[PDB]
Design a protein around this ligand. Structure first.
Ligand SMILES: O=C(O)c1cc(=O)[nH]c(=O)[nH]1
Ligand SMILES: O=C(O)c1cc(=O)[nH]c(=O)[nH]1
Lengths: 206, 206
């Protein structure tokens, strides 16, 4: 993995965003780990989070014209990501927010849009944003997320793959489950957690 | 005025946020100028806006423990201000957002709270935030805004003074009408606008 990906994992662990134990997902599936972006709850957390989103976005090389934050959780994520693109990459991006869970604010909604999210569990929320995007003449180019859990969704493919197929876009993640596994292999002291996650990948992974 | 205040005025003018002409305020009053924070609509705009809020906040010396962003417009403003405090002042502040125009997200709502706004036209929205703040055991210490227009509100005193009296808090602005007048006096080329604003201050100013 790239340096910034290792740094993001260490950041998420240090802020208790990424935790191991016995968690029940929205699916009802039981997971040995959980990524809770709600716990990025200070201004330094927001600053670093935006910088990691922006680095993932620049590293991907995907072309986009506008950064879209859908209410409610997308608005702060898009805000700090837009700030980080300007401050750390000298990129001045139009943004648009939907004050709707359309009431649009920000720049004219036009062009290739990058939607920001944290963790994808279903495609429904993305379709609502896609319809507002398309209703204003723009196009959904990609979805930017923190973590791709790389596990089956409702059908045979992963939730991220369902989004890419259904809405004909690219998904860009800061990290994936594969990266989390590679991180844990570097750390002798959490060998036990590494075994629990690898066990989880074999049963539910894609 | 301080350097950052002159820089904020030049920034607002360059991004068409601050405009002169014939505007009708929410009051129905006619003003030779209008400050439209909606036009801070790119990521660089958001980055600089957060930096100017943070500088105003640090310059004021007011003590606060948490930065509160009330939905909808307060959330991006609080986000970029919190980021700027961390990135440019090495201050890591808890934040809380109200996803309500209470559904609170962010850090535990506790302590001395600084609410963020853009332009105060009435105290009603601030009271709703104050009640959520007080309902969670915290206290409203201040309101941080872009521009204090320094004109009468509904009674004898200004809208900002009504907020300070009614909710027993301090209001911190990046700039005031007085600063705008001082800026225009430096600029021979807009002598005509300077006369129109001074005329407006004498009729409506506090
Ligand atoms: O599947 C989920 O509901 C889920 C998993 C996870 O790691 N994080 C999250 O926010 N939701
Ligand atoms: O009085 C208002 O409604 C008002 C004035 C101004 O300059 N900006 C704004 O957003 N509202």
């Amino acid at each position: 993995m790239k340096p910034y990906q290792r740094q993001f994992i260490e950041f998420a662990l240090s802020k208790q965003v990424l935790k191991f134990g016995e968690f029940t997902l929205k699916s009802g599936r039981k997971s040995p780990y959980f990524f809770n972006a709600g716990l990025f709850n200070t201004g330094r957390d927001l600053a670093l989070l935006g910088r990691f989103y922006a680095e993932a976005l620049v590293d991907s090389g995907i072309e986009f014209d506008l950064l879209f934050g859908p209410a409610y959780k997308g608005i702060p994520i898009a805000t700090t990501t837009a700030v980080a693109l300007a401050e750390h990459h000298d990129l001045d991006l139009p943004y648009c927010f939907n004050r709707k869970e359309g009431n649009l604010v920000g720049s004219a909604l036009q062009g290739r849009v990058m939607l920001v999210d944290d963790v994808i569990t279903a495609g429904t929320a993305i379709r609502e944003s896609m319809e507002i995007i398309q209703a204003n003449g723009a196009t959904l180019a990609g979805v930017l997320i923190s973590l791709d859990r790389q596990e089956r969704g409702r059908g045979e493919i992963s939730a991220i793959q369902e989004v890419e197929r259904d809405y004909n876009c690219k998904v860009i993640s800061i990290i994936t489950l594969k990266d989390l596994i590679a991180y844990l292999e570097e750390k002798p002291e959490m060998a036990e957690h590494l075994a629990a996650v690898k066990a989880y990948r074999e049963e539910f992974g894609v």
